[PDB]
Amino acid sequence: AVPETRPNHTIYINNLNEKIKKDELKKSLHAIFSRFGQILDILVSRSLKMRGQAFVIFKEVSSATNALRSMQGFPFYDKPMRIQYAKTDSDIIAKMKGTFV
Amino acid sequence: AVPETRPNHTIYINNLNEKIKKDELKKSLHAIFSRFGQILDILVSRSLKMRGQAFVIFKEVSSATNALRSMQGFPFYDKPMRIQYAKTDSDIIAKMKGTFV
RNA sequence: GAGACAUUGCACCCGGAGUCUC
RNA sequence: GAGACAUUGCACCCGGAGUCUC
């Protein structure tokens, strides 16, 4: 009982604000998760599972681990955003090996 | 007048068959473009611009140049498929730099 | 088609992109 | 909604994914 998130490639924030215009979350999420690293991409939808969250992509665990240990429960526009690692992280990293490496 | 395709990252076949079930093109396209290299992905739709073609992705020009100089106008199921380089190639290669390289 | 109310959630999946007609 | 007929074409873009109602 009681599972665990654990660090895995990147992370995903949750409990986001419920009064943002979606694009406002990218300007804030894609502006704070890159200052101390380099954001590769973010995932924000309007489905039940994607309600009040936004998966962020970095490149290595040590990059997202540094971004997750900086805004741990931080106030965005009017609520504390909780950060949680992404056990699945960017699914393109499963075939990205063909990038050039 | 008279432009040129030129080699660029990967390629795209055209004049494909007009009696395939779509999945049959992937079994043939994704089976011959990998034997002499390593296919990264293929693009086949049903739009006017995507009529009788299938963009293939490799990794480097020398990989697609080798695949394009092997099946130049080859018969698939009942027609000669013409191969043409993809000046745009996979658009993810524009931000894939964050893969790990 | 759209809006309000719900959920505290590991998503990057999926479907369309040429006209014509029943 | 689907099928036939068209186009010989550098696409990987885009839109949905919680219910309730007008």
Curated annotation (Swiss-Prot), chains A, B:
The modification N6-acetyllysine is found at K59. It is found in: Nucleus. Residues 9-88 form the RRM domain. The modification N-acetylalanine is found at A1. Component of the spliceosomal U1 snRNP, which is essential for recognition of the pre-mRNA 5' splice-site and the subsequent assembly of the spliceosome. U1 snRNP is the first snRNP to interact with pre-mRNA. This interaction is required for the subsequent binding of U2 snRNP and the U4/U6/U5 tri-snRNP. SNRPA binds stem loop II of U1 snRNA. In a snRNP-free form (SF-A) may be involved in coupled pre-mRNA splicing and polyadenylation process. May bind preferentially to the 5'-UGCAC-3' motif on RNAs. Belongs to the RRM U1 A/B'' family. U1 snRNP is composed of the 7 core Sm proteins SNRPB, SNRPD1, SNRPD2, SNRPD3, SNRPE, SNRPF and SNRPG that assemble in a heptameric protein ring on the Sm site of the small nuclear RNA to form the core snRNP, and at least three U1 snRNP-specific proteins SNRNP70/U1-70K, SNRPA/U1-A and SNRPC/U1-C. Interacts with SFPQ; component of a snRNP-free complex with SFPQ. Interacts with IVNS1ABP (via BACK domain); the interaction is indirect. This is U1 small nuclear ribonucleoprotein A. It comes from Homo sapiens (Human). The lineage of its organism: Eukaryota, Metazoa, Chordata, Craniata, Vertebrata. The gene is SNRPA. The chain holds residues 2 to 102 of 282 of the full protein.
